[PDB]
Amino acid sequence: PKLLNRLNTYVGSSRVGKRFKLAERNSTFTTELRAGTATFLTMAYILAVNASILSDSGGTCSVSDCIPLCSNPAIEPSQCTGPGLRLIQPDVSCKFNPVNPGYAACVEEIRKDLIVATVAASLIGCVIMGLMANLPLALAPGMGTNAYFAYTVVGFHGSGSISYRTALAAVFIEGLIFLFISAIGFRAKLAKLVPKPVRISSSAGIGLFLAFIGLQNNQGIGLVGYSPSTLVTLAACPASSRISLAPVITSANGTVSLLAGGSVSGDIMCIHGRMESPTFWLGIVGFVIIAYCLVKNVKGAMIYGIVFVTAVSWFRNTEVTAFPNTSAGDAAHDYFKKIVDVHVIKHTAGALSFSGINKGHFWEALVTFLYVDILDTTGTLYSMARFAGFVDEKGDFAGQYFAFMSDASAIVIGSLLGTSPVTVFIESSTGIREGGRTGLTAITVAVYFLLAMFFTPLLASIPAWAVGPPLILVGVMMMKSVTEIDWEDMREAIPAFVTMILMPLTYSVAYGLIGGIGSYVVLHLWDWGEEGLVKLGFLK
Amino acid sequence: PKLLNRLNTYVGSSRVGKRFKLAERNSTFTTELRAGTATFLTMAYILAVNASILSDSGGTCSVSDCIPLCSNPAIEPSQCTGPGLRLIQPDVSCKFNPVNPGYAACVEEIRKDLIVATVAASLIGCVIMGLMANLPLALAPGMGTNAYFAYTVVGFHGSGSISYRTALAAVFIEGLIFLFISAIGFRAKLAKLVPKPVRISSSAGIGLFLAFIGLQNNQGIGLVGYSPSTLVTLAACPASSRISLAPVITSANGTVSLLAGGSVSGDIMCIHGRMESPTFWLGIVGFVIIAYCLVKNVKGAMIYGIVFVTAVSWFRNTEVTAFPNTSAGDAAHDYFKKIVDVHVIKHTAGALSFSGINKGHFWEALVTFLYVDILDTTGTLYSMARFAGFVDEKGDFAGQYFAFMSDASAIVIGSLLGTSPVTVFIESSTGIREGGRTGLTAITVAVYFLLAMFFTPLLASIPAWAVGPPLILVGVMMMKSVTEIDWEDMREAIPAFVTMILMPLTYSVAYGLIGGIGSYVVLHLWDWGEEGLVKLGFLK
Ligand SMILES: *[C@@H]1O[C@H](CO)[C@@H](O[C@@H]2O[C@H](CO)[C@@H](O)[C@H](O)[C@H]2NC(C)=O)[C@H](O)[C@H]1NC(C)=O
Ligand SMILES: *[C@@H]1O[C@H](CO)[C@@H](O[C@@H]2O[C@H](CO)[C@@H](O)[C@H](O)[C@H]2NC(C)=O)[C@H](O)[C@H]1NC(C)=O
Ligand SMILES: c1coc(CNc2ncnc3nc[nH]c23)c1
Ligand SMILES: c1coc(CNc2ncnc3nc[nH]c23)c1
């Protein structure tokens, strides 16, 4: 026959091959390898996106690592001794514009830690799913929860109500709760507890939220900046033509003065040169590349676009460079020079903190994580089971129990490594479409994630305009659920619309879910009350 | 028989009755009156919403009417004579926070003018449609174009690139162009020139834009405020707990100083007390009222909710009052005391200005108006023709030619009166569902609009939290078009997603359309090039 056929027949009839039920599922070794490769190509964008988004959270370090800064910018702090010269002690404002150099350095170290954490969590989840559940599903930090954890639960550079360690503890406890409810078969009841329009429209709302993030400045390609009158207008002006905003006090004559302690923003307001940012146009080029790759059914569309934009940004002395001519840029380029590096997690590994359990925001974030994971994992797992033809008449696909337990265990392990919840990727369908049927597909994806390590220097040098279009197009892909909402029935359209729109506007998944569920409950109060009276016999 | 039957038979067989073809359409006089009443009840919210939105544009008056203000707030300017005391001459900043009292007074006068202008334009459009076209369609300033004209073309208090008079000239010329192309049957070609996904998703994008406006502060109920890190978060804190933002200059040590000439914003940032604004909760109550009225198929849902919120706000010494204890509030309450007033347009009538024709923003706004009107009017007119069963096998419903000419003439007249383009309302379907078939329905709506005059004092005292939920629910109603987009085909999903999302985020209908069309063209360049090569014979 051939070497490939000999390998396939040897593996299929071996003890390892029969452990994965290769022969019973009509695929032995090379179909599984090809399916795993296709799935990894489809999901590889996460290696960059998850790390960047979680690094934007600020990590585990606080003002404690902000180096004191001299009164005058031109003198390095060690030389901050002289007449009328003093060292300014850092405060909370050191974490934001202008970011303290020490905090930025710690954020870069956290980005390396989170790259390794994403790779390790995805690897472990894939291995657990392949061995325990024996399904061709790949696990990794979900895109829906990455942004919620980074920009809402924790906030940009720790500006949220919950600290990064407390958010990790919330994710850990959420994974434990999910594992518990799945183990006792009580998950389906929680799934039903969520209103149908809200459940369906949460995906579209999260897609809009991710797209909005991809159109911010510190997150994506720009194109959406601050506006005094409208709060959002056309950004994409060059970084030099952007200024920060500070709170002020108005009066009845026209005087305006700064407010002490005000939280100054990033360079989000454009003063001139709109639609002239070279980084924005490079991001648009990457968007076009990914869009054509998706249209042409090319596996790895997002990774190809990210690679193009990042490689164009790897040049040192351009306006779209990822390594500006500064100390931080010099350090980033020095780390990037080493193509391969075995980075060890030093900050985000085992950074759980249960101080904020009593806080209400902790439980808001915990419940949002729990329900996003429940709904997403249920829908994705059953859709992949349908794709692979494992769903029987009753709706059970054999390894569903262990699939959900594996997902929950992966969430807990990811929390222990310092990353947002890890879920089963819909990109796994690609591997299913290529013939993957057993757990060897997940093991292949895990091996590719192993290979993803030793490349943190390349993965840590991906700019915002590279993250960018991947986020916008992920938001595009998640909008297809709007067709499942009955927009003629207002009792279902209003909750769905609220769920979709509050998520980007309030910029929070939890607020979108709360508003949608509240509107659904309010709009059905009349129907529920009438039905209760009827069931009691008052009405006919 | 009965008095009603005698009236119906008398009118149906009279010359006036046969002029409207009553007998040939199976409805004589009371069916038309009932249909007109139902249509007016459905569309009455415009009387408030259009006037408020266009008043937010700032009107025809500039810094020229800003009264000079004394150095100290406690001394009225006439007494601004003394040691170290001077009168500050107004500048452009007088138009924004803190708004100069003179400019605010002129804006209130403009609001009265625009209430009368909306009523008059709707009346004239309805009369023209009823007489010339003989259809049961009601015309009024369209909701899609109100916000674009007020907040994008002209900007809040004239902060946009085009002045209010120049925008009126743009609307006038756009109406003339629409009339010209309709007269020569060339409108359908322009309609086809717009890509299908962009055409379908523009409605949903405008709905999202209107909903976002309804969640702003100076426009709706709040619930969306400024955030330094995310640019949007949860508002609805009390007005006392909101502060303005000003541009500043950052450095490498941490000093931040004000930027001279910076455009200070309104009180958009919440410092504390989130979700505690009584006005926001009153707006939420109005939202619930309108939502139940829509669910229960109650005609006039939005007008009922607006009336409830406005009446609750008409009390003088509450936290949700429309007449705060100030000079402006006192004047507003004094005008409101007179229930009936015959206001005469003094500023916005005949305020056309053709200075900005050469500007590119003038033509951007003109083309956006033209295409929004073309697509909206085509879709709405043909949908109403289908509702009334006037569409034959070929797709012609007799009076379509004169219907489009009437719409264009109404647009021109509305521009002459100082209001955004006037279109045929989808609410006309209500009158069609009640039996209205002839032009007498439009005349009845016009008579109800006559009655709408003599009530400017009541219509001019409608707060933002009353406009509010009407805008959010209008945005809800316009989302049903998303089901007409194929979200599995990326060549159609990406342009549709861009069109939907750029409109609220860039906060502009023109930018949304431009981005959607550009993405559609880019994504189809490969297909078009391949097809061109094939048609030339290079490929097979
Ligand atoms: C941080 O450095 C800036 C200089 O870049 C200091 O600016 C001071 O404030 C204004 C701006 O020039 C002037 O009135 C002062 O003369 C500036 N002084 C100096 C030495 O530049 C700013 O004061 C510094 N911040 C602190 C806390 O010392
Ligand atoms: C505008 O009015 C205020 C009163 O509300 C004047 O008071 C100033 O207030 C600021 C901030 O509280 C102080 O820093 C100034 O020293 C105050 N000056 C005076 C003279 O009271 C303010 O001066 C007025 N501005 C102008 C330009 O006249
Ligand atoms: C809603 C939509 O997506 C999520 C969590 N993230 C996620 N789930 C499933 N498959 C994914 N593939 C990438 N990101 C994914 C919640
Ligand atoms: C897209 C959706 O609505 C418009 C213009 N406004 C408008 N058109 C048709 N019927 C309406 N009814 C209220 N506002 C309407 C454009």
Ligand 2 mean position to A274 CA, how many Å? Answer: 36
CB contact under 8 A, A248 and B249: no
CB-based contact (8 Å) between B301 and chain A?
A: no
Chain A residue with CA closest to B490: the answer is: A295
- Report if residue A186 sits inside a domain: yes
CB contact under 8 A, A224 and B254: no
CB-based contact (8 Å) between B256 and chain A?
A: yes
Chain A residue with CA closest to B211: the answer is: A501
Tally of CA atoms within 13 A in the half-sphere of A341 that contains its CB: 18
- Which A positions 76-95 lie with beta carbon below 8 A of chain B? 88, 93-94
Mutate to test the pocket of ligand 3, among A425, A471, A513 (most ligand atoms within 8 A of CB): A425
Q: What is the distance between the alpha carbons of residues A386 and A429, in angstroms, rounded to a whole number?
A: 10
Mutation choice for A interface testing from B250, B293, B483, B488 by most A CBs within 10 A:
B250
CB-based contact B472:B287 (threshold 8 Å):
yes
- Report if residue A261 sits inside a domain: no
Cβ neighbours of A155 in B, within 8 Å: 229-230
Please name the helix (run of DSSP H) or strand (run of DSSP E) that holds residue B521, with its range, or none: helix B509-523
Chain A residue with CA closest to B509: the answer is: A233
The CA distances from residue A45 to A49, A118, A206, B239, in Å, are 6, 11, 18, 44
Q: Say yes or no: CB of residue A89 within 6 Å of ligand 1.
A: no
CB contact under 8 A, B508 and A476: no
State whether residue A463 is helix, strand or coil.
coil
Q: φ, ψ for residue B277 (rounded to 5)?
A: -70, 120
What type of residue sits at position B91? D
CB contact under 8 A, B232 and A507: yes
- Report if residue A258 sits inside a domain: no
- Report if residue A130 sits inside a domain: yes
Where does ligand 3 bind, in terms of residues with CB under 6 Å? A 142-145, 203, 206, 372, 376, 380, 423, 425-427, 478
CB-based contact (8 Å) between B63 and chain A?
A: no
Chain A residue with CA closest to B57: the answer is: A229
CB-based contact A103:A347 (threshold 8 Å):
no
CB contact under 8 A, A480 and B473: no
Protein residue with its CA nearest to atom 11 in ligand 4 = B425
Mutate to test the pocket of ligand 3, among A198, A423, A424 (most ligand atoms within 8 A of CB): A423
- The DSSP code sequence of B336-387 is HHSS-------SSTT----GGGGSHHHHHHHHHHHHHHHHHHHHHHHHHHHH
Q: What is the distance between the alpha carbons of residues A160 and A167, in angstroms, rounded to a whole number?
A: 10
CB-based contact (8 Å) between A297 and chain B?
A: no
B3 contact partners, CB below 8 Å, separation of at least 6: none
User: Among candidates B254, B127, B358, which has minimal Cα distance to A264?
Assistant: B254
CB contact under 8 A, B232 and A73: no
Atom of ligand 1 nearest to the CA of A73: 2
- The DSSP code sequence of B452-484 is HTT-HHHHT---HHHHHHHHHHHHHHGGGGGGG
Q: Say yes or no: CB of residue B73 within 6 Å of ligand 2.
A: yes
Cβ neighbours of B298 in A, within 8 Å: none
Task: Give the count of domains, chain B.
Answer: 1
Cβ neighbours of B212 in A, within 8 Å: 501, 505
Q: What is the distance between the alpha carbons of residues A333 and A356, in angstroms, rounded to a whole number?
A: 38
CB contact under 8 A, A259 and B243: yes
B537 contact partners, CB below 8 Å, separation of at least 6: none
CB-based contact (8 Å) between A506 and chain B?
A: yes
Q: Say yes or no: CB of residue A251 within 6 Å of ligand 2.
A: yes
- Report if residue A228 sits inside a domain: no
Protein residue with its CA nearest to atom 3 in ligand 4 = B144
Residue B247, beta-bridge partner list: A245
Mutation choice for A interface testing from B71, B227, B231, B474 by most A CBs within 10 A:
B231
The whole-angstrom distance between residue A392's C-alpha and the CA centroid of its chain comes to 33
Atom of ligand 3 nearest to the CA of A427: 12
Q: Which position has the token pair 């007249």?
A: B413
Angle between helices A440-452 and A101-128 (to 10 degrees): 160
- Report if residue A439 sits inside a domain: yes
CB-based contact (8 Å) between A232 and chain B?
A: yes
* Nominal resolution (angstroms): 2.8
Tally of CA atoms within 13 A in the half-sphere of A168 that contains its CB: 25
- The DSSP code sequence of B421-449 is PEEE-TTHHHHHHTT--STHHHHHHHHHH
Chain B residue with CA closest to A474: the answer is: B494
Ligand 3 mean position to A381 CA, how many Å? Answer: 11
Residue A270, beta-bridge partner list: A242
Counting ligands in written order, the one closest to the CA of A83 is: 1
Distance from CA of A353 to the nearest CA of B (A): 24
Cβ neighbours of A94 in B, within 8 Å: 254
Q: Which position has the token pair 């998850």?
A: A50
- Which B positions 475-494 lie with beta carbon below 8 A of chain A? 475-477, 479-480, 482-483, 485, 487-488, 490-491, 493-494
User: Among candidates B475, B473, B468, which has minimal Cα distance to B205?
Assistant: B475
Angle between helices A196-214 and A509-523 (to 10 degrees): 150
Distance from CA of A233 to the nearest CA of B (A): 4
CB-based contact B66:B94 (threshold 8 Å):
yes
State whether residue B410 is helix, strand or coil.
helix
Q: What is the distance between the alpha carbons of residues A13 and B196, in angstroms, rounded to a whole number?
A: 54
Instruction: List the beta strands (DSSP E) in B94-241.
Output: 139-141
Q: What is the distance between the alpha carbons of residues A193 and A498, in angstroms, rounded to a whole number?
A: 18
CB-based contact A444:A435 (threshold 8 Å):
no
Distance from CA of A110 to the nearest CA of B (A): 19
CB-based contact (8 Å) between B98 and chain A?
A: yes
Q: Solved by what technique?
A: cryo-EM
CB-based contact B264:B246 (threshold 8 Å):
yes
Q: φ, ψ for residue A81 (rounded to 5)?
A: -140, 120
Chain B residue with CA closest to A151: the answer is: B230
User: Among candidates B447, B275, B83, which has minimal Cα distance to A518?
Assistant: B275
CB contact under 8 A, A256 and B248: no
Domain span holding position A175: 3-69+92-222+277-536
Protein residue with its CA nearest to atom 7 in ligand 1 = B255
Burial of B285 (0-12, 13-18, 19+ CB in 10 A): middle
Q: Which position has the token pair 């003038």?
A: B362
Cβ neighbours of A246 in B, within 8 Å: 245-248, 256, 258
Chain A residue with CA closest to B263: the answer is: A228
Cβ neighbours of B215 in A, within 8 Å: 501, 505
Distance from CA of B209 to the nearest CA of A (A): 10
Gaps in chain A with C–N over 2.5 Å, residue before each: none
Chain A residue with CA closest to B147: the answer is: A230
State whether residue A242 is helix, strand or coil.
strand
Q: Which position has the token pair 């005469």?
A: B344
User: Among candidates A119, A56, A41, A60, which has minimal Cα distance to A463?
Assistant: A56
- The DSSP code sequence of A475-496 is HHHGGGGGGGS-SS-HHHHHHH
Burial of B363 (0-12, 13-18, 19+ CB in 10 A): middle
Atom of ligand 3 nearest to the CA of A145: 5
Burial of A337 (0-12, 13-18, 19+ CB in 10 A): exposed
